[PDB]
Design a protein around this nucleic acid. Structure first.
Lengths: 102, 87, 50, 109
RNA sequence: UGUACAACGGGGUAUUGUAAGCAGUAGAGUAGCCUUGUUGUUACGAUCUGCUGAGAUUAAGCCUUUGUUGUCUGAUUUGU
RNA sequence: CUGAUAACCGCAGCAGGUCUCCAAGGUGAACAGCCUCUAGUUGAUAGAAUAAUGUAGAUAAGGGAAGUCGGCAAAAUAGAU
RNA sequence: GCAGAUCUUGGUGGUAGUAGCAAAUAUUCAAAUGAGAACUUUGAAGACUGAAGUGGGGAAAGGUUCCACGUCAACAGCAGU
RNA sequence: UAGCGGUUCUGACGUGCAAAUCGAUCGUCGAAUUUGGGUAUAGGGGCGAAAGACUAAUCGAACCAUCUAGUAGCUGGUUCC
């Protein structure tokens, strides 16, 4: 049929963006009968239109990479592209030292 | 540079709708119309521009008062009402 | 626009109500020769110059 | 006259997609499986199963596997029936090693 | 309807270069332990060795094949 | 309501032009460059072959500017200590 | 009175169904609508913009494009429901 | 970098995506910086870190209308036997 309006209202009702709404093709004509937000809120509850939950982005190799930098790795001369002032400046190393003495 | 991309920068108006001639010829900075000449006491009209007079002389609008002058001359400007004779 | 005068919005109202075809009954009229609506404006092809 | 016999296959897509541009190695793998089913089964309407469409596009446009274990079925047509009375229908079959398998006729029992 | 032809598979040839997985008083050290040693073990450990001249790919313009599965009379046109 | 490779201007649904606020993870000095999440798109005539000559990228043994008005175009160097 | 004024206005030609419709990495399968679906809609993929966005709003400018129903002769330089 | 500019390839395009764009390469990037909105300056007049440049695709001098059917020793045409 045509289900532009129903996908628009479904994303607007459930709260998630249009890239995450599910409109199953078995019930399609029934979804084409629902032309209001209140009817969408009844097609959401029974399970006809669901969330399509988030694509995972596991910051885990980030955690392994960080934990490996904690032990003293990834710090040779070739894993190092900014200068000795750009990474940790002279001024901050000094302000750390001289407040400590003070 | 002086052709189409400089045409891209053309988002304003010099002119807005004049109150006397309704034309979008009232200059915003100059505060004066350019087709009629509001807010002067006159309407600008020139014998060099014979078409512009023709576009705005008498007889092009409604004639909300002049239309009933010759007719009202035609009776000799009578006042009152007519009588009733028969039928 | 989106934050307008009232004079310009009044002219949008008049250019809205003029933006419709002939009524069908004018075509069938006695000695009618108005075949269509010739003063029709569209917002893409003819900007109204306010 | 029945000719409904379902057969499984390995199609060697490597010697079919050879030299094809990288933004056309998956869709031409599709247009090559339709020709393959025309060549074997003989009919001209072919329906790929969408699980096969997943099995072509696992590794993007240009990472088509070399050999796909197909199951080509041939069926009769209905519902204001088309220019052929029969069609083919190509499903994937899900195997560990698509290397080393011959062609095998599927029995329907 | 044929030592035909094709899709596969096998083999040769070729290219790269030793796969996945398992194991190992191999392993710089470092922790945790105990009879605290005269290889004292357990765990972490890029890598290394054995299986592995393996594994992958091999025709799209490589070679061969008795193995497996199939295909083999549609239209059109023509004469002194 | 759009606020722009279709809602403005450029004769048009024109790879141009026009003012700004928000703005995540990684590598990295970086609001660079590449990859991802929330969000948005998947629109830009398609199919088959893939020869001349092109446009855009590339690679060339030995020599090395001998080419040309001229090493112009390309290559090399390139970060950090 | 008319063959010609790079004559004026209107129409029609050959060229010629040719030049071409090639920037912005990209499409594919199934189902449904429908007379008819590379282009519509939904599901499954594959990707892209990569948060100085092809994301959320607004200033200017446009002016009813906003949203729904029905619809496809015209426009959408192919098609189209 | 963003921004602003526009140097070379005398590259692309050159009946173009564009009446001056595209792609690489490049100048500058914290101030004699860039930009919006308001306002001021108008044609032999403005404004000019000056190129006779810019003054709305026009500029050693704007555009519009009128005198104007300007003038022409110079081109072209000038209709039946």
């Amino acid at each position: 049929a045509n289900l532009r309006t129903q996908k628009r209202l479904a994303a607007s009702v459930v709260g998630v963006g249009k890239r995450k709404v599910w409109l199953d093709p078995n019930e399609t004509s029934e979804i084409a009968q629902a032309n209001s937000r209140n009817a969408i809120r009844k097609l959401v509850k029974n399970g006809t239109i669901v969330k399509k939950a988030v694509t995972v982005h596991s910051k885990s190799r980030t955690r392994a990479h960080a934990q490996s930098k904690r032990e003293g790795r990834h710090s040779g001369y070739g894993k190092r592209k900014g200068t000795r002032e750009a990474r940790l400046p002279s001024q901050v190393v000094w302000i750390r030292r001289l407040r400590v003495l003070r | 540079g002086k052709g189409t991309p400089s045409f891209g920068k053309r988002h304003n108006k010099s002119h807005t709708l004049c109150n006397r001639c309704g034309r979008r010829s009232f200059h915003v900075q100059k505060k004066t119309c350019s087709s009629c000449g509001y807010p002067a006491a006159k309407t600008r009209s020139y014998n060099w521009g014979a078409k512009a007079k023709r576009r705005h002389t008498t007889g092009t609008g409604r004639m909300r008062y002049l239309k009933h002058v010759s007719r009202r001359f035609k009776n000799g400007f009578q006042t009152g009402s007519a009588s009733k004779a028969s039928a | 626009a989106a934050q307008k005068s009232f004079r310009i919005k009044q002219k949008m109202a008049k250019a809205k109500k003029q933006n419709r075809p002939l009524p069908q009954w004018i075509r069938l009229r006695t000695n009618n020769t108005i075949r269509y609506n010739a003063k029709r404006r569209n917002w893409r092809r003819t900007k109204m110059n306010i | 006259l029945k000719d409904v016999v379902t057969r499984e296959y390995t199609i060697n897509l490597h010697k079919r997609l050879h030299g094809v541009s990288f933004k056309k190695r998956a869709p031409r793998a599709v247009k090559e499986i339709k020709k393959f089913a025309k060549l074997h089964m003989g009919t001209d309407d072919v329906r790929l199963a969408p699980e096969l469409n997943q099995a072509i596009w696992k590794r993007g446009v240009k990472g088509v596997e070399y050999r796909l274990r197909l199951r080509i079925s041939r069926k009769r047509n209905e519902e204001e029936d088309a220019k052929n009375p029969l069609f083919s229908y190509v499903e994937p079959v899900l195997v560990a090693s698509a290397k080393g398998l011959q062609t095998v006729v599927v029995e329907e029992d």
